[PDB]
Structure formats: structure tokens, C-alpha cells
Amino acid sequence: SLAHTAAEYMLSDLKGLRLELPLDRIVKFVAVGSPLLLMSLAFAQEFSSGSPISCFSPSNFSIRQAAYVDSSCWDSLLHHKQDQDKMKSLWPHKALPYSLLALALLMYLPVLLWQYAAVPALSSDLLFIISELDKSYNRSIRLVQHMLKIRQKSSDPYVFWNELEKARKERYFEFPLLERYLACKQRSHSLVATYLLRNSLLLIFTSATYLYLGHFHLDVFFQEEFSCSIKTGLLSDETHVPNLITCRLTSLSIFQIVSLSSVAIYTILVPVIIYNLTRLCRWDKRLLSVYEMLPAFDLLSRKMLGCPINDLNVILLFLRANISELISFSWLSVLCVLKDHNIDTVVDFMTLLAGLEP
Amino acid sequence: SLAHTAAEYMLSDLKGLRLELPLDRIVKFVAVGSPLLLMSLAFAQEFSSGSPISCFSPSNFSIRQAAYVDSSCWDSLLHHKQDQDKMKSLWPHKALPYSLLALALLMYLPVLLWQYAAVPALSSDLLFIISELDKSYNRSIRLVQHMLKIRQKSSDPYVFWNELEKARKERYFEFPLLERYLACKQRSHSLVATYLLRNSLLLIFTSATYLYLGHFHLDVFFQEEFSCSIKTGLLSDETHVPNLITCRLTSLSIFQIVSLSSVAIYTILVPVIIYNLTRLCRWDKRLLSVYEMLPAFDLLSRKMLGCPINDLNVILLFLRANISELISFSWLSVLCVLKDHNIDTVVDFMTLLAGLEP
Amino acid sequence: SLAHTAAEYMLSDLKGLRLELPLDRIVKFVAVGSPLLLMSLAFAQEFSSGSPISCFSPSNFSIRQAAYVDSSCWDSLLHHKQDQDKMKSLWPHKALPYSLLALALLMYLPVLLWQYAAVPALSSDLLFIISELDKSYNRSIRLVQHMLKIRQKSSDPYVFWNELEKARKERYFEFPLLERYLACKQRSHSLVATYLLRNSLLLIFTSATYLYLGHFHLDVFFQEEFSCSIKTGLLSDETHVPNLITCRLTSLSIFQIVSLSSVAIYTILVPVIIYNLTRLCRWDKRLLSVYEMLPAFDLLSRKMLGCPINDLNVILLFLRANISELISFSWLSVLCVLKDHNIDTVVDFMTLLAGLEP
Amino acid sequence: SLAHTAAEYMLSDLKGLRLELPLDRIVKFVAVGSPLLLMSLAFAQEFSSGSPISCFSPSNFSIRQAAYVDSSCWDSLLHHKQDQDKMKSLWPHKALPYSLLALALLMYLPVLLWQYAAVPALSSDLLFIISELDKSYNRSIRLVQHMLKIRQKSSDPYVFWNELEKARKERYFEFPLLERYLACKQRSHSLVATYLLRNSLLLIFTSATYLYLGHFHLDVFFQEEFSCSIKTGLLSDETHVPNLITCRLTSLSIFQIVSLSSVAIYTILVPVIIYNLTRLCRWDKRLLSVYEMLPAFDLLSRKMLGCPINDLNVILLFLRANISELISFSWLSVLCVLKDHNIDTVVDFMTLLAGLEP
Amino acid sequence: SLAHTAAEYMLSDLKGLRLELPLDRIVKFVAVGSPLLLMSLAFAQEFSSGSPISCFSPSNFSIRQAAYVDSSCWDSLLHHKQDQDKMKSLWPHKALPYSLLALALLMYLPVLLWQYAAVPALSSDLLFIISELDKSYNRSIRLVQHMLKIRQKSSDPYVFWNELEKARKERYFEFPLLERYLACKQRSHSLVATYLLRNSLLLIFTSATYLYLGHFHLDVFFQEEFSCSIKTGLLSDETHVPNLITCRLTSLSIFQIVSLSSVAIYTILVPVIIYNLTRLCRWDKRLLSVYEMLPAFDLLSRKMLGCPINDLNVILLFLRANISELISFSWLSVLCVLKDHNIDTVVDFMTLLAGLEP
């Protein structure tokens, strides 16, 4: 089956970076695999089909007179109703899996755009930021051994501030590339377009699916029988039934169940992407209180003004998911205690000797 | 078969931490695999089905006159009883495996919520706690070589208490991050919600399964025969049997055995999750006697007050399963001897020389 | 086939420890694989079954009149004997592999209990004991170089006993954790329960298998033919045979051979587990003579009193299988020469220079 | 096919030791694989069987009247000869592969006993012996540099014997563990039992195979036709042939060829195991002449007395196959020149400078 | 198919040594795979066989009257010719693949003997020789730095011969183990027997194949039709055709093509093994001119006398294929320039500085 190859290349399972949101991953998985699951269920295994169209041939017909009967109607699904001569065609019945696979291949386009048009630049930017930030750490670790003996023999404030103010006017304190780079990117407005188009494309795809199920479906839904004609051409000069009646389709139940499953999964899926859109309409300040005290993280919370549709918002949202990898997963995450000061000076007097790590 | 792929991703077999309880693992395994086992048994291998519906066609019928007979009834399971004209449908018979697979995919949702909404925060918290605790050990091992010569040449109490009281007023004795962190988490009430919802979701799922087996089942349970009609449409202008009688279904025994197996496994499974719920309604104090003497473990047993529904209870329950990994599996587990004192001073005089380990 | 998956997870092939006895392994292998082997042999490969029920339809019947004949009896195995109207049913014939697979899954429960309820504690205990014992060796190897020059230039007894008695009153001679730990475990009585239940569960399972083969089998054993009825319902208003006679089952030979194989394997298997039970009713003292001279092994043979049902007996039995891994496989195993003294002093004078190993 | 799994576990391909003799390996391979080869050849590939029983139904019979004819005789192979009423049964024809697979699984039992009841002790013994022997070498290599300058400047005998006699009364010359261990094992008589039982078991298995081919075979060997009866029960009240004649079996040629192949392979296999038995009835002294001059190997040839049924004989036989691994494959194997002395003193004067190796 | 398993174990793809000749590999490949290729081609894929025997039944015969006709002749291939009553049997037609697979398994016996009876000793010998030869190199490399400054400042002959003659009477020049080992093996005559038997066995196998194709084939080669008899037993009391005529076999073309392919491949294969035999009848001296100047290789060319059937010849032939692995692939192979001297002294004056390699 081609489904094996599709799963082999499509949906088959830098160097540590998380570039895609978990909710985006979930919605991608459901929207991509569900058409494939309906594909596998409808035609294979469960319902051994054989001939999806079944007919009532007259008794006088031989073997492949009736074989022509049965084989000339599946490709010519047309209801010659007596009500003039409106041949109602039954193309949705033979087009169900075709539309399913077309929808499945259509669902993956936003992934293509998000993975080709935005991944390389974002990955390069995050590679630069991780390089500068681990350099920021190893240029700051050198302060924990300068503060193991001089930090002890002095009366608290005039060594917790005298060296801190000396470090304040010292190069290691500031991170100039950080503010300049963050400015040069926050003024940019290119990455938000990819996000908005990647969401709107799947939204309009869902709308098109709704229209497809509303127009071409919902009309032949309780009809399981139709009358065809064999002398719709040169057969007229023959002595047999003038109208081949009751071509019964066998997969009406599968038709109904796949239609209801498709409509239900998309009804339950729609609100999630709307929530994803609304995630970008506000500035996140859940933990802004602790970010304003740290030297490097002060700049992140400082540039919180104006309309929130900026590349800085997207960068921050993707950084919060990567703020706990192996090294940023530190006192930062441990700092759940200052969400409720001269006492903290002697508390961090001991903590600086506690963050020795290796 | 898709079952192979499902087992390949679903149920297929930080860095040492145990995040899931063994009883939870057992109930998950039984509730997830049992629908799959019934799926594999019912349709494949054991009972080579062929055509699950069998009919009695008249003798005059040719090959695929009777093939239409047999193929137009499986999808149109309707009993045209003579008792007006109540067409009793037989959709449970063709919906058994569909409902089975839907129930199988439904059973895994609580696992999804418990693994996405609570695992990262709990794992980070336990990573912090293990880091601080192995630091607590390697800042306490330094006491076993200070007590190899000064510990020997003195008259017992005034070196077993003089140094101990000096160590009592010494920094290594206390663990400030422990009480502050434990307070900041015991006042929190977020993790218990995930536990209660993860249990209640499977409970209501079991209730829904009971309702499904009570309404749609238990009605067609001893009926193996029904009469259908072929001229339920345009067939009426034909000379054959007016009513196609005795469409016999072949899988009634499989129907009954799968229904009884499903109801029995859930009856035997229900009390376990109730026990899991009741596990959180009480404070565990089985070994609180030995916890009150140890320095760090005194705080764990000290905060035992009020209503037991707190995140501290869940943290303690998950810690007791992880209290014997490689290092906490020590004198702690060895201390099964003080569950039945100046003599113990000379007993631990020798024990401190016995816990040299490397 | 599901048998492939079962073999893939069930029965498919710390860090060196042997936790399961070889005889237990053999009985587990035979009791678990034999139902699977009968499963594979009975239904697949050997006997291409097709239709396990065969019937004699009247000559006037068409194709699927007789197909209904053949398909409506396998699921309705009932002998309408003329002797009133005792319908003898033939459910064992269609339930053979179901009971086989149920028995196969039932056989593995004692393994589950023995592997979950006792393995972790025993493994931790043995890990502690191996750590303390290799420490006991590397704190005793230091005696073979103190005895390379002082051991030579003295008149035998007053250096083979003067240093030995000095070593006797020396710390390295005794192993305090050994006697204290061995006491704290020999007074315990928890592990023997797991052993006794793991044996009794398979014993009662064998008894249940015997009852199943005695009641539901041994009755339809020479019967290969039975008469059914088609008008056991709405068929009565039809002109055909009033009683469908001679529904012949084809797998009677397979029935008999699988029944005899099952009963024979369990008759030959029963005494082994009884022997396993009797293994725990006595204290093993085959090599107690050599254990009483060694320092550490003297305590093992010293606590041989009272009723033998103790956790110490189980620990010793599992230790004798692990007493020859890589280091305990030493002079211990070499000491087959003292099972038939001042001469041995000069014999071990040379042996201490012979146990230099690296 | 289960043959794939059997080959996967059974017969599928310490740390250098050779524990099994090449002739034993050959006889094991032929006796184990040949039943499997006949299994694969008889039923699969070569002869596409279909229905191994073929019958002559009367012309009036319909499709599955004759299908019942053909399917009710394979399981009821009984010749109702007119000669009273001796129903000769044809169970060997349907039992050929069953007996083949039973014989195949039976052949592996001696391997099981030889691999479980004797391998661990023998492997431990050989591990000890290899450890002591490579120690014997590296305590003897130190003599080739003491003899590079003192060996040169002296008049031959009084340095080829003066140092040799000094080395003779020196500790490195003798190997006390060797004679004591060899005595403690040569007096033992446990390992020879495993060898004799492992041979006698396959011998009695071959005898049982001969009896099986003599009683149950050789009787139905030229009979390809037999007459059955359908009214051997409730069929009597029917109007058809009173006796269903000429049930012809199709696999008579395969029957004959497999019988002849089995008997021929075992006739050609019998003498080899008899030779293996006779190998232990004599003391091997082919190269005893060179063993009596070497220091360590003198003890091996010294204990050659009495009846040869001892564990020492088995140990020596397994050692001769391992005497050429990497280090014992040395001058020992090179010493093919002393099988046809003061000249050899100056020949070995140069050879000791030739065995410098690294 | 069993062919997959056979290819999986048989013919499926120390530590660098080449133990088998390329021509031997080619002849083994062709003689082993060609029967398997004919096996795969004759019965599978290409010619969908169905029933290899086809018969002309009379028109009055029903379905399985003629099925008995067709099924009772394939196993009873006998031509009841009118010419008394010589039943000519047609067993080659049903024995073609049996003889093919027997020949295929027979072809591998010489490989078995050559791989079990000679590989271990030869591999050990070559391991010893490679160890001594790379030692011979690293005890000779030390001459290229003693000759970097003393080699420069002297008038050519009295430093190209004065040091060379000093090295001539120096230990590093000679290789005593080489001449002694080469003598101890060249006097041996055991390995040539394995070679001669491994060739003669396949030769007599080819002769037996020729006899088989000459006697049992070439007689039924143009006969595609034969007449059988059904009343060759108890059928005589029936009213049908007294002689069942024209049992036509369908695979005559496959018979002819496989026979011609087998005979042709063996005719083209015969001379190669004869050439292999003649390879051992002469002493190879193609490059003996360059071997007589090298120190170690002089002994190899020195022992070229007498009849060439010796183990030394086989050792040399297998060494020439291994003389270019990684280190013997050196100036040796580069020395293609002395096959057409004081000038060479200054040429090798520069070459010794050119063979510095690492």
C-alpha cells in the first residue's frame, strides 16, 4: 500500500532546539493522520468490499452478460429517474477516497511553508543566541571564586554592593550584542506573516472541507438504490430489459460513518487554531516580575510596549519553550520562591556557594 | 494490520526517575491492551469469518442473484418483522469492532493529560530535589573523616554531643532550600487536579461503557435470525420472493463472548481505581517514627496537618517510590532495626565507620 | 499471527545476578510454551482446516442453500438426538483454542507476582551484599604482602598464630554489618510467602486444568457425527428436510491428540513443583564443614536452628547459585580437597603466595 | 513457518574455550537438521499437496456432496476390507510429520543434559586451569633474560645443569596446585556419567526409531488405495453408494522416500557414536614421549594407570583439543622434531634465544 | 520458501587473513548456486504449474470423477504400453527437483571438509607467522635511524658493507624460528591430502551427475504422452474406460532446458578444477630472482628441491595471496624494477631514507 510509503516519508520518526509548538504538533498530527486513518479503515481490512456496486440481473442472463451488467454501472453511476430525464450522478460514492487523499496531501502544505520559509532563519538566529548565552554564562561563572574569601570577611552591604557596583561598571555585567540584536529583530516584521498564513491556510482548508461536505454530500445520504440504463447507446437494437433497475451500492454505511467522523473531528479541531491565533494578540507577562531583576533578562521584559504583533513576541514564545533545555534550566526554574529585601542578601550569600554545580 | 502500528507507537518499549505508579501502570495496561486483544481475537486468526451474514436464497437463483442476496443484507441489517412494520436494525453487530477501537483510543486520553499537563513540571521539580539532595550528601560525607581520630580519644557524651551541638549550630546541619521549597509547594494545589481528573475520566468512561452495553446490547443477544426485504425500493416490479427470509448472522457466539469479557474485565477493574482515589484521602505515617530523627527528613514529617488534599501528599507518594534508587537506598532502608538511648551512641560510633562506602 | 507478538514480548531474549532458579526456568518454559506449541500445531500449517464442520446436504440444494447448511451449524453445534429432546451441545470443539490461550495467559501470572512483588527488594539486598563482600575482599587482600617477608623468617607457629591472633583482634577480621544484616533478615518472614504462593498458584491451575479436561472433555471424545435442525425457528414454513442429519466434525483426531498431549505433559510436570516445595522443608548442610572455618562464612552456617521456613533459607539457596560468578568463584570452589592439622599450615603457607591472582 | 523460529533459537549462530568435540558437533548437526530437512521437503515447496487424499465420487453427486466425500475420509482413514470386518487404519500417513517433529525435538535432549549438567563445572575448571597455566608461563619467561649473558661465558654442562639444578630446587620449577588439583579430579568419577548417558540416550532413541519404522511402517508401504464407508453411522437412512470405494492417497512416493532416507541416515550414523564410546575405553599415549620431559606435562603422563574410565581421561581429551589456542600453540606444537642427548643442549642453547617472541 | 533459509545460512555474507583461493571461491559459487537457481526457476515464478500432469477424461465423467482421474496419475506415473505389459515408469519427471536439491546439498561437502579439517591448523600457523613477521619488521626498522648520520659521512663501500657485515654477524639479521618452523612444516605431508580430496570429491560428484543424466535421463526426453490404467486393482468391477489414455505431462520443456543447462554448466566447469589440480604439480619460481636477495625470503626460495607435493607448496601458494595485505604490501610489491651492482648502493642509499613511512 502507498500508505506505508507515505508514512515512511511523511510523518516518520539545531541538535536539541525545539522549533515547533506542542499544540501545533498535536493539531498537525490529528489533521494529517485522521484522513489516512479513515482511508485505511474504509477500504481495507474491516469491510472486504469486492464489488461496491451490486445489481439485480434478469434470470435469463448468462455469466458475463450479468458481469457486463455489474461492471458497466460502477463507472457509469447515473440514476435514470422517471421524473425531463434528470440523470442524477453518483460521483461522490466513487470519489470519497480520492477527495480523502487530496485533503490529506492538502493538509501538509502549511507545514511545508512553515518548515521551508521560516525554519532556516529562525534556527540560525537561535544558534547565535545560544552561542552568545553560553558565552554569557562562562564569562559570569568566574565571579563565584572571586567571592569565596573576599565575600566572607566583610560587613555584608559594603561587599555585597561595593563589588556589585564595581561589577555594575564592569564589562561582564552588560550584554551589548543582546540589546542591539533584540532591537534589530523587534523592529522586523517578517516572521509573523508565516505564522498567520500557516494558520489561515488550514482555516480556509477546513472551510473548503465544510463546503465540500455541504454541497456534494448531504444530498445522496439515504439513497442506496438507483436505476440505470444499458441501452444508453448502441445497445438499443437488442431484446432485453429496457431499463436495468436497482443498482444497489453496498458502502452506504461506510459513507455515512466517514462523513460524520470527518465533520466531527473538524468541528472539535476548529477552536484550537483560533486559540493559537489569539495567543499572539497579547503580551505574556506571567513571570515578568522575576525577569526585571536579572541583568540579561531585564531587556526582554523592558521592550513590552505598543501593539503585540511583532517578531519579538514570536521569538519570546519560542524561547519560553526552550528556556529549560540543560543550562537555562537552572536557578531560573528554581526561582519559584520570589513569587509571593536585605535578608535575601544573606540567602544569596549562601546560594552563590550553592550554584557551584561542577 | 493497523494493530501493529498502534502497538509500535502506543504502548511500546529524568534518566532514572519513576514518574508513574506501578498500580497505575497495571490498570493502564489492562484497560488499553484488553480492547486490542479482543479486537485481534474476534476478527482474525481464531474465527475465519468470510461472510458474517448468511442467507437462504431460493433454488432458482443463479450465482450472483444470490450474491446480491448475500451482499445487500450485511449493509442493510433490518428485521422486517410481521408484527406497524417495525424495522428492527442490527447495527451493533456491524459496530462491535468500531466501538471497540473507539473505546481503545478513548482509554488513552487520561494518559495523554497526565503525561503532558503534569510530567514536565514534576520532572523539573524532582530534578531540582535530586540535585540538592546529592549535594546534601556530599556536604555531609566530610564528617566521617573528622570523626576518625577525635571521635576515639574522648569520653563518649562530650564528643558525641559537643561536636554534634557544634555541628547543630553549623551550616551543614540545616537545609534552608528544603523548608522554603517544601512550603512554596505544599501551599500550592495544582497537581492534585490532574490526578483527580485522570481518575474521574476513566471512571466516567467505564460508566459510559456500561451504558453502551446496557442499552445497545442485551437486546439482540439471543437473536440469530431475521427476515429482510429485497423489494424495499425499485425491486417491486420483479417476480421473485416478496420477502427474503432468514438472514442468519454467524458471529453470535463471538458477540456474546466479547460482551461478557468486556463487562467482566471492567467489573473486576472498577475497585482498583477507587482504591487509588482513597489512597489520597489519608496521610501516610507508616514510617514517620524514623523520619522525625533525621535532620532533612524531620521537615517532611513535620508538615502533617489539616486536610490531606495537597500537592505535598502527591510529592511524598511519588518520592517514597523513588526513595530507593541508588543513594537514598542506604542506611534509610537499612534502618529496619529501630522499629520495636545511650547504647545506640556506641552502636552508631561503629556505624559511622561502617558507612564509609567508597 | 498474534503468537509472533506474544513471543516478542512474553518469553523473549543486577547486571550479572541470577534471580531465578534453573528448574523454575525449565518448568516455566514448558508450562508457558507448550500451550503455544499446541496452538500453532492444531490450527495452522499441519492440518489445513478449511471448514471444521462438514455436512451432508440433499442433492436438490443449490450452491448457497448448502452454504447456509454448512455455515449455520458451526455456530449452532447442537445434537438433536431422538432420545425429551436433549440438545447436547458441542461447545468444547469450538472452544479448544480459546481455552488453550486462556490457560497460556493464566500460566504467566505466578511469574508476574514473583517478578513484581519480590524482585526489587531481593535485587537491592543482593546488590548491597555484593558491594559489602567485594569490599570485604579488597580489605583482606592487603594481608598477602604483609606476609611475604615476615611470613618467611620465623619458626612457623609463632608467626602463623601470632599474626593471626593479632589479626583476630583486628578490625579486618570481623564483618559486623554481616551478622547484623543477616539477623535483621533471618527474623523476617516475607519472601517465603511469595515462593509458596507462586508454587501453589500453578498447582491449583494444574488442578483446574485437570477438572476442565475431566468434565467438559472425556464425554465428546468418540463422537464424530451429530444431527442438527434447520427449522429451529422461522424455517418451519418451508418444504425441505425436517432434520438436517450428519453434521460431521473433521478435527476429532486433533481434539484427541491435543487432549492427550495436555494431560500427559501436566502429569509429567506435576512432581517437579512438588520437589521444589520440598526443597524448602530442610536445611542444606552439604558443605557446612568448610563453611565453619572461614571467617565470614562461619555466621552463615552458625544460624542453622529451628524450623527451616525462613527468609534466610531462600537467601542462602539463591546465594549458592550465585557463589561462583567471578570472584566468589575462587579458592572456595577450589576447596574440594578438605572433604575426606599442622601440615596444612605449610600447605597454606604456599597457597597464600599462590592466591596472588593479579 | 515454525521451522524458521526453531532454527532461530535451536541451532543458530569461556570466551575462546572449545567445550564440544567436532565429531559430536557433526553427529548433532546431522541428527538434528535431517528431520527438519525432511519436514521442509515433504510438505512444502517440492510437492504442492492440496488434498493428500483423493476419492472417486459418483457422477450424480453435486459440489459439496463430493466435498463431504473428500473431507470426511482424511480424518477417518479406515480400510473397510471385505475380508469379520477388519477396519485397517491408515494413521501413519497422517502421522508422518508429527512423528518427524517429535523425533526432532527428542534428538535435542542429550544436548540439553550435556549443556546444563556438565558445562558450568567443566568451564569453571578450565578457567581455573588456564589462569594457572598463563601464570605458569609468565613466571617462567623470566628465565630467558637471566640466561642471555651468564648462559654464554661458561663451558656448557656446568651452566646448563648448574643453573638448571639450582632451578630444579627452585620454586618456579614445580607447580603444586597442578598435582593436587589433578589428583582431586582424577579420583572423581562424575563427568563420565554425563558422557555415557548422552551417548546412550541417542542410541536408545535410534533403537526406538528403528522399532517405529519396523512396526508402524513396512506394512502400509505398497498400498495406495482403500475403501471407506460413509454410512458408518446415521447416514444409513439415505439412498446412495453403500460403500465409498477407492480413497486414493497421493503421497505414497513421499512416504517411501522419507522412510528410506530416515532409515539410511541412521544406519550410516550408528557406527560414529559407537566409535565415540570406544574412544574412552583406552588411554591415549600418541605423544606421551614428549610429555614426560616437560616439567608440568610430566604429571599428565605420569597418572596413566588402572582402568581408563576416569574424569581425568575426559579432561585430557578436551584439553588436547584446546592445547593449540594461542599460547599453548607454541614450541609444544613445534616439537615435532624429537619423534624419531648433549647436542640438543647447544640446539636449545640457541632455541631459548629463539623463543623470545615479544 | 526453504531457499531463503538455505541462502541465509549456506552462502551468506584470522581477522584479515585470506584462507580460500579466488578461483576456488568462483567454482564453489557456481557449483552451489546453480542448482538453487534452477530450483527457483523451474517450479516458481516463471512457469505457474498448477497440475504438472494433464489427462483426457471422458465426457460422461463428473467433477471429481475426473479429479480422481487427474490426481491418481501424478503419483502413479506408469506407461501401460500395448507392446508383455512393460510398465515404463516416469519417476525422473517427479524426481527432478529432489535430485536437484540432493545434488545441491552434496556439492557443499568438500567445503565442509576443507573448512573443518584444515582451517584451524592453517589459521593458527598463519597467525604465528604474521606475529613473527611483524616482530621481524619492528626489530629491523631500528636500522633506519642508525643510518641517518653515520651513513652519510663515509666513503660508500666501507660503510655500506662494514655496517652490513657487522649487521650480518648480528642477531637481527637472521630469523632462526623461520628456518626451524619451515623445516618442521615442509617435512610434513598432511595438508595436501585435504586439498586433493576436496578436489577429487567434487570430481567424482560431477562424474556421478554425468552418470545420472546419462542413465535416468536421455531416455524420456521426447515423450510427452503416456497411457495409464485405472483398473489396476479393485476398479475392475466398474463400467468405464478400460484404459485411461493420454496422460500428458506439461513440463517437458522445463525438463529439457534444466537438463541441458545442468550438463552444459558442468562441461564448462570441469577443466577449472583440473587446472587447480595441475597448479600443485610444479614449483612456482616466477619471482624467485628477487626472493634470493632478501634475508628472510632467501630461505623460502632455498627449499625448492625434489617432488613438489609438499605442505610447503600449499603454504607458499596461500602466502602469495596474503603477501600484499597492509605491511608485506611494501617495497616488496614496489620491487618491480630489478626484473630486467654498485650503483644500486647509492640508489638504496636514498631508498632507506625513503622507507621511513611513519
Curated annotation (Swiss-Prot), chains A, B, C, D, E:
Provide the GO biological process annotations: cell-cell signaling; monoatomic cation transport; osteoblast differentiation; positive regulation of interleukin-1 production
Residue numbers on the Extracellular membrane side: 50-99, 223-253
Entry's localization field:
Cell membrane; Cell junction, Gap junction; Endoplasmic reticulum membrane
Major localization class = membrane
Family to which the UniProt record says this protein belongs: Belongs to the pannexin family.
Q: How does it assemble?
A: Homoheptameric.
Stated name of the protein: Pannexin-3
